[PDB]
């Protein structure tokens, strides 16, 4: 088999094999040399003899209140730890890209291929004695028996962090900009070509699609009026193409930029927010110039509303995900002087580790009603009687679920849970611990230490043996949380160096980019740097009504 | 009119309309300040001060031969020269790019839409009062007339810096795999949407088109053999689509990645050595790795070749044009501790600088034959008749002409120079002197100071009225070249950062890429750090003929 199997290079040497059975490791800029790159060079020693673990910083930032109060009070102190946290790990995220699911070698097709989602780890070679490697057994557990055991919702888990359905949905409108799997070619592939924040998911992918959900009047998107309130248009009034079952009524089939999105009414509720936002912008920018033609009208609230998300997603979003009394900061300006690529590639695992099924709750609280999944999918009348005024109200209060903790996943979405870890042992996943040791974790010695538990902890070694052939995603999902947070720790320092590279790296954080006059002058510009999860709401939803990202 | 098309904002200032009648320049980092960015910042005054004019810095390159003699011959201080050419032109280049033909200020669809060009400077608006603006009269002068006086070639003037036919076909083969306008769409749009060096042109834009080029054995590309020579394969026998006169033979209807290259057997002489560097690398990579299979050989060997080009471009082929005592040097490492974006947008400017027809000679004068324009063109059967080694021999000994002076054009190209007027103007191309302003040069005052001369300047003085409306284009190949050169200021101020922004702009240049794993080890990678244009030939034309550059 491959000599690579036992993945034997480590401190992120590259392994090369040199014939049939024997590999060569290359350890350049590892800080590592030797055989497997496990001596490390003097500068290296000092290195890590300093390095903090990930759970210290994480305390230091979820402590001392008082202190950060006054820290996030000076501007100049504020931005220059800003400044350290978009830094301290340069070069974890490969940029430019390198392997995706048919090239665990570098190549030109792997690199120049936008249509395959890239890797952080390289998928195991297929002529590999065992799943994993050479580790484990011949076949992984069974994945249902995997599902049943420690990830199915037996009672309903709160977040103890209070995230709400206002952030969940948040959360998948989001992301499924940059997470489009391409089903028809397999889950390695995606439709999303921009990889990163486009808006496409608003917008259109493509240029054809987009023209057929714009006005061409000031610059706006088409929309309808239904009872004196502005929703998206319908698939029969623009010619687009969406996905809906057939027994919907073409006057409830709403058309935006991502096809999947009349799936569900929160997704319909950022839809129509987002669309009501565009509009809004070009009612300003047409008042700044009078002179100004539909296209320019168009483009500019497009690239202010790009600002407006990378804002919200920083300052709000990942805010509440952190955890931290030291509010984050959304300035491009923090990286002129840094060394840093403004491009981004989605990668598979980035994907996979954002399959936050568990955050979804039992039924969907609005107003009075309790909507079931059967009776809330792609139903749009629940938002078209309830109105987003209530949509917005009943989902800021309604709780969502824990992520990390072990069973929490909905038996609803019993079945896509059950496609996140098939699909990743169909990309041939490296193990857990790989992926911890890529991201310069330690690796977990038992279940015990991964659950903080001793239950699931069992359950699982009855079903993989070995700590060394944990499956990422159901780690990810039974993984001992932080201290009453959402998240364990391989959620966090995985997500998190994917999520700030996926929006600094935005053309319109580069020097040239982030200036008033892209955005049609200071007006323009204040809009972004402004923007936030609460204005978003109250300047499209009527009655300005108070929301959040937590209970 | 629009309120900019007087072009106000200076040091790269950013215009925008604040009124159908009012402007308002953006200052941002460009050290200057004042309505139209022209009142500089104290640290600006300074650096103004001290800078040293690109005549001056060119005269210090071309002199002091001893002094540069050392240089070359310590490889530390030769690394160190190099690192300041690659850092002199910090902010020269927008990465990630902006305008395009049909965007004169920043968009969305400007910088993800790949099949346009995009533009160092915006296109003039569309309703300017004069092509270039405001100046000049209602009407640039008649394409032809231009093209007759000052353009035409009278007598053939040989290149005083002694470029011969192989640098000639070595410039139209390496650069039209990134100059592939797309007509179908537009001059402002290209069919090469890896925007750099990608060998497309050797292996295909698709990766359909790919597949029919490849054997699928060894990693190899598909060949045939003709007398005992290798070429490459036909059209018949891939499938592959080729541009051909339906009176050519079956035989000598080769298939190369490039639709053109069958144009003129010059560009299928590289075609030809370029395939079998291409093999040749395969039987090396697989002698190192038995183990390997056909896709990854072809992958690694593609990486290979991508390298060699990049080293030979640098050093064999800047080098020349440089003229320069100095030894260029190709080494990505000089780059990893500064500032660098590794990607690369091509600009429609640097295309149109690089239609150097006056490099082209009245004749094809290979062994005892002198071929015409009519002969040679798509006439595979003199290189097969001649073969690769008496064209080599051949082209080394043939000079080429000068491509600044002025009247050298070949009028067997006439409607192509003509074309390139006419294109520009429909691109709206600014003049010669905001682009000029745009790369930091300072404007000429009179037509007399861009020819150093008085007849064309006369004809030209006539024609244009006004030097501010001179165009860019036809200025390039009638300006005053630098001392025995073969171009002037404003192509080599031009083409230096364009060429080194794609050349080290590609991603086997970022660390991730630049390691011997990548390139199958250090045997695969010795081959790219020791590739010239001489080991080229060596290696793939029988007998290992003498070749360089120069006559
Ligand atoms: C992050 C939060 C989040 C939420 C709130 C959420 C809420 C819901 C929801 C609510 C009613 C339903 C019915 C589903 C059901 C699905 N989700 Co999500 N999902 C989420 C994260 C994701 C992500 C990320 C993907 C990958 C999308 C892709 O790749 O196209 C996903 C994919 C899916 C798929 C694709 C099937 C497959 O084989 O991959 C289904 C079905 N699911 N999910
Ligand atoms: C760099 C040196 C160089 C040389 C030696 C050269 C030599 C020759 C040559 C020799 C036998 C012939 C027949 C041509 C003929 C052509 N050249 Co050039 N060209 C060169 C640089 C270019 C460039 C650059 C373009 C534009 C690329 C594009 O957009 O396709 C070009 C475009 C063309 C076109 C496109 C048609 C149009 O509408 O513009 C033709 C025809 N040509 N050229
Ligand atoms: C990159 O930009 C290209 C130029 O803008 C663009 O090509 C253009 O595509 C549009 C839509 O696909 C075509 O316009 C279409 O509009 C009518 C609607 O009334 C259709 O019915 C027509 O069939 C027509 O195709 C433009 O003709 C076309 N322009 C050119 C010069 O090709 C590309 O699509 C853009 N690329 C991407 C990836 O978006
Ligand atoms: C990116 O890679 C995919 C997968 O290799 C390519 O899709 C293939 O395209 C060929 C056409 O040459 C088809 O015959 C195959 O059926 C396709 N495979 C799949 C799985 O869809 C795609 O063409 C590549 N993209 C580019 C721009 O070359
Ligand atoms: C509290 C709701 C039951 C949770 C118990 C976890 C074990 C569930 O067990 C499984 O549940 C699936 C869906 O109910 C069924 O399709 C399976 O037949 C069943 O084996
Ligand atoms: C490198 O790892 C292999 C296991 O893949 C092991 O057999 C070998 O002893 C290691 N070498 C060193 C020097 O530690
Ligand atoms: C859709 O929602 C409405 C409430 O607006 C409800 O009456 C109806 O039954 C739902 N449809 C389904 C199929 O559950
Ligand atoms: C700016 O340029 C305009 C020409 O467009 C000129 O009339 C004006 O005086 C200039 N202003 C300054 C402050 O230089
Ligand atoms: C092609 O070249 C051959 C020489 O090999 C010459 O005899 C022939 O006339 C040429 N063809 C044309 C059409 O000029």
């Given at each position: 088999h491959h000599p690579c199997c036992s993945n034997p290079?480590?401190?992120?040497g590259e392994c090369m094999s040199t014939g049939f059975d024997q590999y060569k490791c290359d350890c350049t800029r590892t800080g590592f040399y030797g055989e497997n790159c496990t001596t490390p060079e003097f500068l290296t020693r000092i290195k890590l003899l300093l390095a903090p673990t990930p759970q210290t910083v994480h305390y230091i930032l979820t402590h001392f209140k008082g202190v950060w109060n006054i820290v996030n009070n000076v501007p100049f102190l504020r931005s220059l730890i800003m400044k350290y946290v978009l830094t301290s790990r340069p070069y974890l995220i490969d940029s430019p890209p390198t392997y995706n699911v048919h090239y665990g070698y570098k190549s030109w097709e792997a690199f120049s291929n936008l249509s395959y989602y890239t890797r952080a780890l390289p998928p195991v070679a297929d002529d590999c004695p065992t799943p994993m490697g050479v580790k484990g057994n011949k076949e992984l557990p069974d994945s249902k028996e995997v599902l049943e055991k420690?990830?199915?919702?037996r009672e309903f888990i709160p977040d103890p962090q209070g995230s709400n359905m206002m952030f969940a949905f948040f959360a998948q409108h989001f992301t499924h900009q940059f997470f489009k799997t391409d089903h028809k070619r397999g889950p390695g592939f995606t439709r999303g070509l921009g990889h990163g924040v486009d808006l496409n998911h608003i917008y259109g992918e493509t240029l054809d699609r987009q023209h057929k959900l714009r006005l061409f009047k000031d610059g706006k998107l088409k929309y309808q009026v239904i009872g004196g309130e502005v929703y998206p248009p319908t698939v029969k009034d623009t010619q687009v193409e969406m996905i809906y079952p057939p027994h919907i009524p073409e006057n409830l089939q709403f058309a935006v930029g991502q096809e999947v999105f009349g799936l569900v009414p929160g997704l319909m509720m950022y839809a129509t927010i987002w669309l009501r936002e565009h509009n809004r912008v070009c009612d300003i920018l047409k008042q700044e110039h009078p002179e100004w033609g539909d296209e320019q009208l168009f483009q500019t609230s497009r690239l202010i509303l790009i600002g407006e998300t990378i804002k919200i997603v920083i300052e709000d979003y990942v805010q509440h995900l952190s955890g931290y009394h030291f509010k984050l900061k959304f300035d491009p300006?923090?990286?002129?002087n840094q060394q840093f690529q403004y491009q981004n590639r989605i990668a598979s695992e980035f994907n996979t580790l954002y399959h936050w099924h568990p955050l979804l709750p039992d039924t969907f609280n609005i107003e009075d009603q309790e909507y079931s999944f059967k009776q809330f999918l792609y139903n749009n009348s629940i938002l078209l009687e309830h109105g987003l005024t209530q949509f917005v109200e009943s989902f800021t209060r309604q709780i969502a679920g824990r992520?990390?903790?072990?069973?929490?996943?909905?038996?609803?979405?019993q079945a896509v849970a059950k496609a996140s870890i098939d699909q990743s042992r169909e990309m041939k996943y490296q193990s857990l611990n790989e992926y911890r040791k890529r991201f310069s974790l330690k690796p977990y010695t038992s279940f015990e230490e991964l659950t903080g538990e001793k239950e699931m902890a069992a359950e699982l070694k009855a079903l993989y043996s070995d700590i060394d052939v944990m499956e990422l995603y159901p780690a990810l999902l039974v993984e001992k949380p932080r201290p009453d947070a959402i998240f364990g720790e391989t959620m966090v320092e995985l997500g998190a160096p994917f999520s700030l590279k996926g929006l600094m790296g935005n053309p319109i954080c580069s020097p040239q980019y982030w200036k008033p006059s892209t955005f049609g002058g200071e007006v323009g510009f204040k809009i972004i740097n402004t923007a936030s999860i609460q204005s978003l709401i109250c300047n499209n939803v009527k009655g300005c009504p108070f929301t959040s990202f937590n209970v």
């Open positions: 290079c480590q401190n992120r420690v990830l199915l919702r300006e923090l990286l002129f992520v990390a903790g072990g069973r929490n996943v909905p038996i609803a979405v």
